[PDB]
């Protein structure tokens, strides 16, 4: 028998299983597509979530009700001391995926 | 793209079935699958055969529609189709296989010895050529 009144399901089934992360560090599951023309640069970094605060800024959004007005916004500080490059690794394509 | 055709007078080679390995001449075409052939001088009786068992040769006789066995025999002998066919690698391979199938044990031993001696000598010559 159909449910009398419709309602969307609770939660997003694409974020399951709601299990503890396998690792404490975040795993990069995909890197930005590489463009050979641009200068050599790194694609990621590591930092620590220090805390939150709020700032006041002037908004430049033509057509907005806060154009040329000051707004208060919450921000997060991520401390990012310089990293040290300790090694080089490369990946070769194979019929079953890239391989170190 | 196609050179040899199923035409009256075309000499065919029976590839499978009753008279396997013989030559006949197409004297008539019954439908897209069946041809009336008659190899009087190659020990093949005037019969109707499915084209699936036949293979076209390069020889075409100057026959007439439904030429009788006497005329087919005359044309076959005049053209010497058997002799010309015996000169082709098609017939040479058949003859070689016929000899091979009837080798005795002693003949096989003799062939083994001769073949390996020839291969050794040819390999010596090939090494000479390769060095140069």
């Amino acid at each position: 028998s159909h449910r009398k009144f419709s309602a969307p399901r609770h939660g997003h089934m694409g974020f399951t299983p709601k299990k503890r992360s396998r690792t404490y560090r975040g795993r990069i599951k995909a890197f930005p597509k590489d463009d050979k023309s641009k200068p050599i640069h790194l694609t990621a970094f590591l930092g620590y979530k220090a805390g939150m605060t709020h700032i006041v800024r002037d908004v430049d959004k033509p057509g907005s009700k806060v154009n040329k007005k000051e707004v208060v916004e919450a921000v997060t500080i991520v401390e990012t001391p310089p990293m040290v490059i300790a090694g080089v690794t490369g990946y070769v394509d194979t019929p079953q995926g890239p391989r170190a | 793209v196609f050179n040899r055709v199923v035409q009256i007078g075309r000499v065919v080679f029976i590839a499978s079935g009753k008279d396997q390995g013989k030559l006949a001449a197409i004297v008539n075409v019954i439908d897209g699958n069946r041809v009336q052939i008659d190899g009087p001088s190659s020990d093949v009786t005037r019969t109707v055969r499915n084209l699936k068992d036949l293979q076209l040769t390069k020889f075409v006789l100057k026959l007439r529609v439904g030429q009788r066995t006497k005329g087919v025999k005359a044309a076959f002998d005049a053209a010497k189709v058997t002799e010309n066919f015996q000169k082709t690698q098609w017939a040479k391979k058949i003859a070689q296989r016929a000899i091979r199938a009837k080798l005795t044990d002693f003949e096989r031993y003799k062939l083994m010895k001769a073949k390996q001696m020839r291969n050794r000598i040819v390999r010596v010559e090939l090494a000479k050529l390769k060095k140069a």
Partner: protein, 179 residues
């Protein structure tokens, strides 16, 4: 039901007659040309048709003779026209068909196979009214007429050859074109 079993149906000439009685001391003699697998089927079919045509059945009749007919010259190619009547799933129809063969029995066998192929008609639903040899100029079917050419020629385009007595796997390259 009656079936056209057997490669190349045989041809029989069956002669029979109603058994004479006191009121009919002499009775007419009937003859039929039958195409069947063997002479037992030939006799049964003869009685079938004769009982359909005249008021006589196998019980009151007798078979004077039954003789197989062999092609006079199986070394010549002929065009055969077949007039037949058959039953479809809906109604009754008359057909005229044409074949090319060296034997009339072969032509009738071709007719039975063709009727089965093109109309899903079984031998129990087919009556062969007539079979004759037609002249080349008197044929009226394109498939047959297309072979009435003295300069007929054609290749064998896409030949798939089956290996007979040797392993399933090979390194040989298969060729379907033979010029």
């Amino acid at each position: 039901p009656t079936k056209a079993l057997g490669e190349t149906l045989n041809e029989y000439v069956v002669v029979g007659r109603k058994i004479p009685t006191e009121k009919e001391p002499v009775t007419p003699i009937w003859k039929m040309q039958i195409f069947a697998t063997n002479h037992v089927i030939a006799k049964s079919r003869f009685w079938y048709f004769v009982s359909m045509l005249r008021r006589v059945k196998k019980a009151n009749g007798e078979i004077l003779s039954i003789k197989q007919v062999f092609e006079k010259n199986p070394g010549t190619v002929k065009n055969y026209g077949v007039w037949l009547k058959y039953d479809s799933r809906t109604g009754h129809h008359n057909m005229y068909r044409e074949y090319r063969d060296t034997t009339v029995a072969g032509a009738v066998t071709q007719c039975y196979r063709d009727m089965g192929a093109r109309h899903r008609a079984q031998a129990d639903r087919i009556h062969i009214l007539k079979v004759q040899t037609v002249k080349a100029e008197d044929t009226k079917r394109a498939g047959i007429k297309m072979f009435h050419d003295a300069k007929i020629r054609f290749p064998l385009p896409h030949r798939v050859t089956k290996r007979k007595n040797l392993s399933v796997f090979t390194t040989a390259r298969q060729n379907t074109h033979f010029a």
